Amino acid sequence: TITYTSQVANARLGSFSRLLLCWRGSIYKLLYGEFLIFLLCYYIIRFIYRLALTEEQQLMFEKLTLYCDSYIQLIPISFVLGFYVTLVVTRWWNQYENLPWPDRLMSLVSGFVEGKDEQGRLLRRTLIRYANLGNVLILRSVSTAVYKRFPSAQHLVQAGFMTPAEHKQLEKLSLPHNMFWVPWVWFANLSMKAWLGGRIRDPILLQSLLNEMNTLRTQCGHLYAYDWISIPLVYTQVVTVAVYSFFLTCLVGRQFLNPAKAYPGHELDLVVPVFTFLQFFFYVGWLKVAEQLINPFGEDDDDFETNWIVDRNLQVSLLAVDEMHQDLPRMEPDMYWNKPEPQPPYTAASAQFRRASFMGSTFNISLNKEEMEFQP
Amino acid sequence: TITYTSQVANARLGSFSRLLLCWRGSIYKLLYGEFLIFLLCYYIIRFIYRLALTEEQQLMFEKLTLYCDSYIQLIPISFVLGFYVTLVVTRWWNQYENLPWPDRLMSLVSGFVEGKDEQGRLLRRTLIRYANLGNVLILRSVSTAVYKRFPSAQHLVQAGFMTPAEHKQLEKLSLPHNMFWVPWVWFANLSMKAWLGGRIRDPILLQSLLNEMNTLRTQCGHLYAYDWISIPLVYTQVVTVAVYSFFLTCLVGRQFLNPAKAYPGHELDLVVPVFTFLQFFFYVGWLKVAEQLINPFGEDDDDFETNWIVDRNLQVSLLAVDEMHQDLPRMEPDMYWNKPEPQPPYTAASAQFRRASFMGSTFNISLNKEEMEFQP
Amino acid sequence: TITYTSQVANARLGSFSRLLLCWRGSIYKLLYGEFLIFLLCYYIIRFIYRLALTEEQQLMFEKLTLYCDSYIQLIPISFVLGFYVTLVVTRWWNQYENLPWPDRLMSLVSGFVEGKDEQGRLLRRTLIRYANLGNVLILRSVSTAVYKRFPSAQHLVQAGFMTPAEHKQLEKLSLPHNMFWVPWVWFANLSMKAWLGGRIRDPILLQSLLNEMNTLRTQCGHLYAYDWISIPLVYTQVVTVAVYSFFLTCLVGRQFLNPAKAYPGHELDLVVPVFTFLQFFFYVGWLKVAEQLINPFGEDDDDFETNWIVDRNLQVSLLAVDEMHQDLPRMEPDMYWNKPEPQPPYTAASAQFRRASFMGSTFNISLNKEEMEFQP
Amino acid sequence: TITYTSQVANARLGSFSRLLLCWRGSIYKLLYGEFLIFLLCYYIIRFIYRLALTEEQQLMFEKLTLYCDSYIQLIPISFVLGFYVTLVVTRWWNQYENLPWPDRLMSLVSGFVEGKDEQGRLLRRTLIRYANLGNVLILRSVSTAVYKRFPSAQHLVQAGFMTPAEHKQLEKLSLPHNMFWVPWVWFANLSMKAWLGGRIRDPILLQSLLNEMNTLRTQCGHLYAYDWISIPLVYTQVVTVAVYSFFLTCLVGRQFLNPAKAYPGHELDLVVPVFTFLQFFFYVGWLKVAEQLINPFGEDDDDFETNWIVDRNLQVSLLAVDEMHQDLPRMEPDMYWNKPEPQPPYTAASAQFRRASFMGSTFNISLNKEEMEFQP
Amino acid sequence: TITYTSQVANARLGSFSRLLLCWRGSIYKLLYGEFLIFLLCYYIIRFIYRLALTEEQQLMFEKLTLYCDSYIQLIPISFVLGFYVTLVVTRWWNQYENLPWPDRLMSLVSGFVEGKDEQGRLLRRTLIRYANLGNVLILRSVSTAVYKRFPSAQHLVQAGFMTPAEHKQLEKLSLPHNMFWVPWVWFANLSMKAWLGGRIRDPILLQSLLNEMNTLRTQCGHLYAYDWISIPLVYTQVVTVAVYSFFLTCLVGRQFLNPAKAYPGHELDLVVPVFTFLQFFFYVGWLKVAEQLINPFGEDDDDFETNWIVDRNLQVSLLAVDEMHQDLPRMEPDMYWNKPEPQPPYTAASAQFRRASFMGSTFNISLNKEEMEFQP
Numbered sequence A, B, C, D, E: 001t002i003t004y005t006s007q008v009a010n011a012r013l014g015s016f017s018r019l020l021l022c023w024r025g026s027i028y029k030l031l032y033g034e035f036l037i038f039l040l041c042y043y044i045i046r047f048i049y050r051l052a053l054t055e056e057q058q059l060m061f062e063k064l065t066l067y068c069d070s071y072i073q074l075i076p077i078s079f080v081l082g083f084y085v086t087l088v089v090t091r092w093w094n095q096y097e098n099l100p101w102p103d104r105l106m107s108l109v110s111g112f113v114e115g116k117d118e119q120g121r122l123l124r125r126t127l128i129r130y131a132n133l134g135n136v137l138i139l140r141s142v143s144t145a146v147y148k149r150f151p152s153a154q155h156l157v158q159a160g161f162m163t164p165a166e167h168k169q170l171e172k173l174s175l176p177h178n179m180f181w182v183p184w185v186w187f188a189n190l191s192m193k194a195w196l197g198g199r200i201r202d203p204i205l206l207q208s209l210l211n212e213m214n215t216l217r218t219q220c221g222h223l224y225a226y227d228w229i230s231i232p233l234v235y236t237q238v239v240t241v242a243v244y245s246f247f248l249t250c251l252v253g254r255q256f257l258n259p260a261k262a263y264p265g266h267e268l269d270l271v272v273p274v275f276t277f278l279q280f281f282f283y284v285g286w287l288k289v290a291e292q293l294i295n296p297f298g299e300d301d302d303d304f305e306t307n308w309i310v311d312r313n314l315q316v317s318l319l320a321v322d323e324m325h326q327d328l329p330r331m332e333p334d335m336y337w338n339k340p341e342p343q344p345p346y347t348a349a350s351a352q353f354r355r356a357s358f359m360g361s362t363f364n365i366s367l368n369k370e371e372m373e374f375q376p
Ligand SMILES: Nc1ccc(C(=O)O)cc1
Pocket: A253, A254, A255, A256, A257, A265, A266, A272, A273, A274, A275, A276, A277, E071
């Protein structure tokens, strides 16, 4: 992920022009290769036409160039690219929203599962670790970065997501399916055992825990669904053919013909086809953005940081359920203990942001005295 | 379903061009027939015009070809295709989202329904089997692949979804409606009986089970709704007429007239109408993708694997409620038992994915000392 | 509703072309009248121009026809139709989703409300009948088909939705508003009475019932809202004027002028304006689809089958709460009682649908031994 | 609100053409003023050009008219109008959906809060009145019609939404913010007091009440948000400039120049610019619809009837919690008491709506005997 | 935020034209700089072409100007701007919806947490202060205005969001991550302690509190997600290049060439390129609106008032849980105590808003007596 929120906080002069200089995660990094191939092909063909064809062959080539340029506008490139890119961007944000975060579950585990002794610590750590293990199993199933970090369940055991006992249990349970759902059944059974043993004081708290864990299960299921049900191959194929056919045609149709022939549209020959190159930029960059976002769990620069998410989730969840359990800051009267209307101060930098409260759009409507009396 | 997520993980050079070689679930498999018919018609008409018409008839044909080519741009093909394809793709993903997965319910059944004895096993298996039977009844109602696998409720009994007792009960209950809703009433009644008999220890757990089962019922209802309320036939008819009328016109309007007459736009005759064929590719492929996705439960290559979903659900749900009930891995202190900040290792392949935590967009804003003091 | 899901299950050759022959719920049934009026007007005007105007009047008419044809492209017909049709289709599916189905509530009533005696039967039937009566009150308020079936609350009493006692109570309660909300207050009060009398064993079960009934109330409220807050009349007016103005202009602009004058674009005169008629098909059919879907509870062919929904809901809900209460099939061990991995059989027709499980997109990534070792 | 659902129930001949005659809430009412100003300006300029300019000045004016007409197509009017109108219509329906209805809460209050005595009546009326008072406080904040009805909290007291005691309490609580949230804290505290005093028998019922009231609070918050966070002024400004610039240009570019000069596109002069006026109709009517819907709580004809909603909510909620509390119709066996398959009758008008049940799309698939046998 | 809801309440004559005069938050404030640079460049180039080039150089410049003007229409500016602006405006409203409001939680805390003594006051204030502290931690992470107000956690302590004890606890807990999630674990633990100590009377009330707090946690997580996962830099880059390339081309292509040469499209030279400047207005204003909304938590005029939201939330939440706890207005019979149908009065200004109730669209359907009789 490349973050430029801080840069674009305000609408300054040339706000985006400044971002134009970024290289990492830039359109330049995606284009440069295809663009270099296109430029090489274009100039090879130009040199062929100028220095390797007879007069009759040059007449034939010029006829072909006028034909290609006249009929290129048939390809529905904007049509197909618009559809495809909208689908990919919608799916991309959905995929992000389905990334599971233990935070809600971890607060509820830290609260409800009771005991400062070894058994209480072990139970809390085990429940939150089951949540993290479920998440990491689905992530290594759908994400190339995570898979390269944990190319096997033995790697999961060596990295402390999974104990050797859990590894043996998973091996015993093995079906010909992705076993990412197992930790959720383990969580349900361990929560029930905790409640029966009096560590969870009430079935309403047990239900709360199970609801949070089941929300995580639904998110993991959505990740698996997006990973499995790709955007139809047929759509991908059609968009690829649209863009490539358009620019293969441009290789001939955007040749600068001999100015002598004075062909309409070829009066001026600039050796560099500026507008053809700009269209390459737009259309091929549009498709390459789609290529980069179609699987956000790849290793692109703008792909999600699944590895970081995994490490952060493990650290935060273990801290929340172990060190932060019944470990609260001293509860003392606050700054505004007997101040009916607290007014926190503003710094010099933020003093201009002090606003009068918005009271509703109807506040400033003025009516006559006669307009206000109720009628019988 | 054709999955190419792994291929398109990163934004490599020619990432989609590589997918262009796929045949199974390809646009080529959908087009080749209609395209062959179109090509045969186009070349029959070209041979008629060149080798079977007098001079006067050729003048009339050329007038007709100029008329057709001038006025083809009237058909709102992009207009109608865009609307129709957006509707079909939205409905396609919705239909996927309504596929019911027992996972949440199966974890709750495995937890809450108590007893390692025969009666406990039988009760758990029966409840999760009711969930699977409801799902398979709706799927055989809406899916041709599932229906071909289970062309009758007796097939359901022979395949172990339904016991002979359940078959007799369903036959007794028969109304002139789809009986897919019966297993949900059976589930409610059996859950209530389990609670009254003390196998479910608390009404809050009973409510949790019923909520999960009712979510599954809503998903099945949405499947039935999508199967029943087709995209309006009138929209389907209008899009079909748009595409077919456009290409029937192209058969005449995209003839290459005699270059001798030097008709504007007909200066160069390539025997093969490259741009007409490319538009065929785009527009007819667009409509054929819509044809393939309009019912995702058909037997197309890109259609959903409902049979696989059914088999996986049965195996996983029965395992979860029977073998995995109160069968947990040994609970032992984890790798990070006294490590305040766990740091799972990275492999050589994934070492580059180790990132610094994102701390918020405002992190790097620098202010003067004077800018920070609170004002009174 | 016209259903063609079964026909379009697969992407066969001419899949939609086959649907083109449907008459009932077809675009032809919607167009034929307006199309006949348009054709009559067009040919009246053509005969006027050819056989009732002097030479000077024909020059004036030809000038008018060139003017109309040159400036018709000003009307933003595609602009306005796209917007309007998208709004109507979105609202159409929303209206469907707001159709209330008793299924969830009926399973919960059949479960929780206890007693095989007369009083238990009467209580269960009364609660589910209140759900159905609320639904049918809103449906007769918003649906012309339902209203024609039940033109009065006395019809509701004669048809067995409403008892004479309920009719008297409703008459006593009468306010100057739609009384469709009354059965929900009745349901709440009767559920509370059932709980206080011990027929509902627990307040958690009472809360479950009330949540299901309140979901039904929200759906009914959405139906009432869609029925009340029409698409703004101004949008309807603008789209109607767009389409009618476009084709009124076409009556003059799409005349075939005298070929003798050799007016550009009028070289060839086909007595039948094929492209004008095709545009009529597309644009007027687009608007007529909008006309048909704007109120899906009308009596069109593609309108919802509200009457069928009402009858099915009553039959199914009464069966579920009365005959199916604590009436379960014999609970016996299933086919896979001691089969760790059940494998339901495939028929000859479905054998090709047996797939290998999808294991995740990262499954087939191969790494070197060196790429896998954890780094310190 | 203008309702024409009943008119457009079916897809009749000229279904929308009939609506074209509506005046109230019509596009005519919105346009007539701006259209009259535009027509006056256009004909003033035409009379200037024809009767107040020399020959040289007329040559200059004709050059200007050709320039304006050639380059008007630069303004992206359809671009900007499409975006703006889509945003306004989405926000308009959202604003409707956020209108709070007490129905769910009122059924739960009528059920759960117990007692037919004076104290029970007073408690139920007070709780539902707190719900209505919260709603009316937010509505008078966001709606000009409601504000004109209740220009002060003293008006709220005189109209019976607020008691003098509540008015004093609100005055004591006054902060420099909209106090619309106060009744929700009052509701929470009074519900807790009712539960502690035994009027609400169970904390699960207390939680149900609080959830319904908190849903209402979220809806009120969304209303306040839409009222506060307007569509960006910059978007409003850009759309206004687009439309006005387009038609200011049309005043000159759509002049009918002297037919003598025989300027291309000016061969025929109709004194009335039909297509310019039709574009005025479409584009300015599009913007005026946006103007009318941008604040749906104004006093336009198509604006919401907030006053009616307020009055209906008060009447219905007070009836539901006071007269309808434990006041049920006599519970007697229904018409279908021992009819296993009820079949409610159809009238002569609705007999054609009797349908055969939809059994699923796969119902009519026929397979050979050999196609059905399970394979080993 | 700039609010003009009150102004645009009705569809008056020139409703938006009146808003055109606004400066603060206007399109003028965003454009004036870029527009001045563009105008300076355009007129520098015009003066170069008119007063610094030979005749041959002027022929070359005119050829270049015709080339640029002919081929500018290649840049897909409307294509790319439409996509980008739709994404930014959808994100913008989502970001608003994720702003957390304590209202629901504060009503539940004020209700459920019991005790008018010092310990009860302290517990209620602490819980609601944890909610506010979590919100302000996320807001100072994602918002430049909030960060400038609280450039450090010590500023948070000085402003009364955080006690010194909480500051020490946070410092002890410090991980290499944003610690905004800590107050939610603190809230869970303090709620559990309150329940165990009998201040919260029931675990169902404890579950209600935790659900409200967890909703707030999800909203804060969404804010963090939007702040972290920017719109892809590649999209931003492509849109910026589209707009800048288009207007850099316009600097040459929209020169008014010498009228003497009588170049087509250059017959009339107005020194000011009105349509080029209008396109600048539209396209650059479109992009600048996107620049302003891409981060709504910046310091733009149309950016959210996060500081005001923070101050209002603190004041309201502390009032609700401290002064308003078990402090209800006297419960007395209302105005309509024995009025079966309350009819609140209308003022003179609002008398026209008294409407007849909407009874459903089917109300006015008239049927014959024969049409109504049920058939057997
Ligand atoms: N003949 C032409 C060749 C190339 C270009 C261009 O730069 O896009 C324009 C015209």
